Design a protein around this nucleic acid. Sequence first.
DNA 1: TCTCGTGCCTGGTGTCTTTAATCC
DNA 2: GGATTACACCCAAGACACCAGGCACGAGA
RNA 3: GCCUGGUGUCUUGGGU
Lengths: 519, 84, 35, 171, 58, 168, 262, 93, 88
Amino acid sequence: SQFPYSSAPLRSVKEVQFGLLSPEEIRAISVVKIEYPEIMDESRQRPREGGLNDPKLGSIDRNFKCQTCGEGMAECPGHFGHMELAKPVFHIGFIPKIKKVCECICMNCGKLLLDETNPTMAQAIRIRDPKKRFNAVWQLCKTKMVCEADAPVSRGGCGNTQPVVRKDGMKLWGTWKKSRDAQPERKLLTPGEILNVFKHISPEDCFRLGFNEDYARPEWMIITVLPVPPPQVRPSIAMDETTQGQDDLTHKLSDILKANINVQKLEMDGSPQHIINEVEQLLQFHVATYMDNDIAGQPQALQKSGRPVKAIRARLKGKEGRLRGNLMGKRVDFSARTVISGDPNLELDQVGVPISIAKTLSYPETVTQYNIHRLTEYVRNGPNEHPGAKYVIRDNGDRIDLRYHKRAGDIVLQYGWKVERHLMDDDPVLFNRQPSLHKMSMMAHRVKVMPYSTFRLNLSVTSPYNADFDGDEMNLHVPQSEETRAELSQLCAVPLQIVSPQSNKPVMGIVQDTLCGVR
Amino acid sequence: ELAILKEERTTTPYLTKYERARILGTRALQISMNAPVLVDIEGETDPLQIAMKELSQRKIPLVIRRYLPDGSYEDWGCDELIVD
Amino acid sequence: GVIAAQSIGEPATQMNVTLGVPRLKEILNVAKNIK
Amino acid sequence: MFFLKDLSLILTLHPSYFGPQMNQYLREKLLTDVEGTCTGQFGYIVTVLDGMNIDVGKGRIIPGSGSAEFEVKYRAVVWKPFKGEVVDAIVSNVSPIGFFADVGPLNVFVSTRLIPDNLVYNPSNSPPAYMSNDELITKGSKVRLKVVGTRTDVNEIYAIGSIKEDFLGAI
Amino acid sequence: EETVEILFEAGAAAELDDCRGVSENVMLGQLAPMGTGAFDVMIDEKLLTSLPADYAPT
Amino acid sequence: VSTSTVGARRRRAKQQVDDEENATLLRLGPEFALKQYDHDGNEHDLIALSLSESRLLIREALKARSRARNGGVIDDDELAKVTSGAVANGVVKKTLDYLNTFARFKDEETCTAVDQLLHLHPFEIAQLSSLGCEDVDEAITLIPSLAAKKEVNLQRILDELNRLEDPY
Amino acid sequence: IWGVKVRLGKEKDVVRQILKKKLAREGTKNPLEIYSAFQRDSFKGHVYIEARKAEAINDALKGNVNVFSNNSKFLVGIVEYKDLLRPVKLTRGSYVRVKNGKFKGDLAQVDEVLENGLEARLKLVPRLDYGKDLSYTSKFRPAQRLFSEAEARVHEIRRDRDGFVTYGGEEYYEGFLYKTFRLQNLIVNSINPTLNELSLFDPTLNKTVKIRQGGYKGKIGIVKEANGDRFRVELHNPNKTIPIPCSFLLIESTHGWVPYED
Amino acid sequence: FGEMERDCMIAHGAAGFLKERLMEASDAFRVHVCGICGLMSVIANLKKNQFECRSCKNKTNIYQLHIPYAAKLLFQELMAMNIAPRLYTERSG
Amino acid sequence: LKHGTYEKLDEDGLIAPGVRVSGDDIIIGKTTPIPPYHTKRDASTPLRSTENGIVDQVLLTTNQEGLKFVKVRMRTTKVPQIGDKFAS
DNA sequence: TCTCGTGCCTGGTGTCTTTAATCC
DNA sequence: GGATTACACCCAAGACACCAGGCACGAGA
RNA sequence: GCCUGGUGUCUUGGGU
Ligand SMILES: [Mg+2]
Ligand SMILES: [Zn+2]
Ligand SMILES: [Zn+2]
Ligand SMILES: [Zn+2]
């Protein structure tokens, strides 16, 4: 309803398919190639095309429309770019799995070291779960220390002995045993070397390794083109009004972009080889700490302020990250909070609500034939006299703000419109005290509007909330539709909660003064 | 295919507290959007009150589709389910 | 499910063999070597 | 090229339409929205079969909005042309760049480099025509062409023909 | 727990999430298959036909 | 907007170029597969319609619906006014008039005779009825798929089509 | 030749220090047995040292505070030597980008170079104000626009030739600035012309009020909101803003509190 | 509205209320997805009424979703780390 | 510009002692110029939205760097009421 | 009038060595 | 011998890059 | 003559 009409059919999500983004697909969804780390054109307003704030990526400004979708900043989701890497680098998240794949396949042609002829191995391919199957296979093939050219009849092997691959930070070392004891030469297994080997893995061996030909193809664990997130993921902030600093990701993408240009600057002229290894490893470093800056065994990337860079991995974990802080719980509208006081002369299921709170909260009541006369009275009283109203919402969604409407007397209400009226007697609201240890921490009470600024509770409900009146505060939530009002009154209401399933007995009784006095 | 024939319905013939709450709210919502009301409205003009009045006279024109764990389902009309 | 979780946890929040919270912890953590 | 297709349409109904003739309203609603419209996936939907007896099923109530969703399964006569299909036509216009031919709902353009050299546009004749000696292509003349390419605008589809082949032309 | 590790591992093995849990639907903001959401509500076309004719949709 | 029984079409590893509609190569796309399914899940052969069948069904459906609109009370220009809206008026009138000038068997007596005569892929059987031909030489050129089938009767097909064909 | 890792920016210092040590020990019983040392700008953080024995490399760097203590030296191949010592444009009529001053970042045509060979005369679209606020930086400069001599004539100028004026001690010919820049102050390589370069080349609110009827009679206030008939006075006396009808107010003016004749 | 308040509404079985709190009363957002590849890669000009997923060359099989803004944000952060979260609106088994 | 009233500021940009103020009223007006008329941006300080009282005293001076420097002290009186906290 | 020195602004880039218990 | 785990919500006050090089302006000879 | 944006990251002290 707050969304403008769109002819596309509305549906819900039934399935989430995870997987990797192929290099080809990243380019197919990208709307611009990103090359220059200089954000501004030349510090003379309007940001530079092909730069990190290219306007095709989107608008985070109220006055510039998106040059891709034409929508305002509120509706525009943002569109991705892409950044071509001069040399393929590892994805920091997938290194230990890459390492596991090397011991499974031939480091020349890439074929699975065992066949259905091996009886125990033929049992292991039957395992239905992809992860367990892959592990069961690797548990067998680990001890197979040579890729056989011949069946244990050629299997497609190349005859080479296989190395023992070891991880050393962001680098993988493989030690080959050249054919008693002689001298073995461990050379570095670069990402580019491993990349070519992975593309030659057959479709039939791709499945047997627990990967998936359509969604998680194993060479896509190596990064060749980086998706550039739109500005909505990395907004700018203004420290002291006319001074704006950039998000940690914006600075870090500049570093990757600068480092990318210097790899192009090497292969065409003065490369003293030992310099190529220092510059390529540094590109690997920046791409790693851009995604995960908690890599064990090496120093963290630091901002010039000295504090560590906020990588994407750190954005999602922990109490304040995206999942625990914004999705499993979040801040909400139509809520209120204040100190509580008791009142014996309120019914059990009532809550006394201060007038000032009752004028700020609202409920959008739909206008019908049975209440249109009643609702017009609220409109004339306006936002400052109780009982009154704050907005009139048409079916198109335009709100009329009754603070600034000087011709309030000339509004005629049509059926189907909405009036956001003040909170009023017997409206159900959800009442709540933290910590919410059990279900009777949230019960529905009936509002009674009262002077003075505390919430009033009948005294017999202090026990289930484990509330008292020594400074405690409690929270109130106002349902915003006809469906949830009915859910509150018919499922969560106080009298339904008198007996608790915890110990098949009541959790409310007569207490304190009234209990002392009744004896 | 998935639908279970009327003679072979096995789920409970009483309206559950969850089914009751959803029926009252949905019907209330439809009345506030000016759906035709099937009972006489006297003095009680709140949307929730009219819907509760219709429930008490077995006059709510809705069908519960109760999903079973395998995905099959029994359709039960609110006219035939017994309300305590 | 949720009702079960709250019904067991709430009494624990207000409470020579090991008893109370340290013993409860051994169970859920199904420790191989109990105290 | 005509087919019979079993189709379906998702219809959203506002609660104020919940009356005893609900199904009859929906039957009228389906026809008004579907008849005469074109899609690239099926073609032109010419007429729906057995409109007054369509079984609409039961409507799903949308949580949070009150409106009702019907899946109206139905059967229609559909018309989609195809690349490679040889068809007859009736010419609608003649111009220096070729001609336009009405094949039922839509119009097909045949360009000049795919028209044989001996068919010469003659404006001085009354009435204007593509003429020969025993051939006569005036408006309404049966001509036989072959559809060599289909382009899709998802609103109206556009097909390009050719008479640059054997046995195609006036008859 | 192990939030990021689960998701990396889920990608590399192309896991399918069938969205039947409460937590799946809560974080995607969809009505969860529990309590008042454990069933669908349909409109009884048969019972509407017992109403008089002047109530009819045109 | 409007959808069908055929669903999903999720991505596969190997692409396909047997999808591009080519009547010569019997590629009718994913919606017009040889075996379709109706709205109950039952299997069903693809329904391709000749010009003669289609003229009877469409005209019948319009006049039965027109009679129904009249509570139960021939010419093409009169039959097209049953539709609602000038956009609908156009497409329906043009389709009848087009069929009015190219349908050889314009009545149900001859049409049922053609129906029984024709009733082996279902698409080819429908093509032969739509495109009039004189001899066997003319049929396998314009419709080059009839080449390597080695089952004529073709001549007696064309003779019966032309004999049932009224003069003009 | 060995390479050695050193603190960034300290490569020249290390080369210097090695020379001092070499020269100081010449002819003694413990000469520094290196032949040469050098540092290439293109190769940040490295010094290269020429010798016959690795021990001499350790000797050259011993005690040097700019060198990383880790035993990080590396050997260079003979086939890589000359590339280490590779030494490596600008033509009249070509474009360059200015690197300094208010014209920093601007595209300019090379008009000519000095006889000695250091500074080049550039043709530039000016960024001028015609002395408008006189009694400059690159962050507080002016927009680019061709010099207009009639505008200068009107507003604030020496004619020197056909189409040539000296204005505020700079030369403008046919609208362009001609100004000398150090060659080191211009960029000649990998210039990317920009899009822009391709195009070119109620009367009682907030007034104090007294209330003359009602329970708040005699109190001072300020009109906070005057939508219609019902005013919002922010009373002074208790911290409350009240709704009040217009019949009840006196407004202050030049002479006292005046009724609704103001 | 923290994690512990979420659990209380589950115990009450008030599924409808919980949905509304976390969407309509907060950060509700509309996105478009491609019916073929399941990504949020649709370019939607609503005044021109034209939609296209360029990758699938698909202008017809396109759906709209209502999801939390913070979930939309989450998926774009996952895309930036080469993880593809494909949202499909139908099952298949 | 901010949504509150600017009518209590004097010409020096500072409010004077003795004037009652309510929430969102501007009490210190300050502007910052916009880089490249109609060149400045507001950088003023409003009273906290939940408060009221009387301006009591206004200090004007300069800081160590020589630019102008102000402090505005506001006083109000809090009277005990329902909900306030006390203890022996 | 010219040259030298000092100060301010802008651009580019780091480094002397110096809290405790659990399982997997 | 490695990390990961370590209640919930809320209020409020108190803070912010460094060094080097180049250019311009002012003062003194 | 409708729209109408004021920061963040920490640390410390507190409330139940
Ligand atoms: Mg307490
Ligand atoms: Zn956009
Ligand atoms: Zn091999
Ligand atoms: Zn797609």
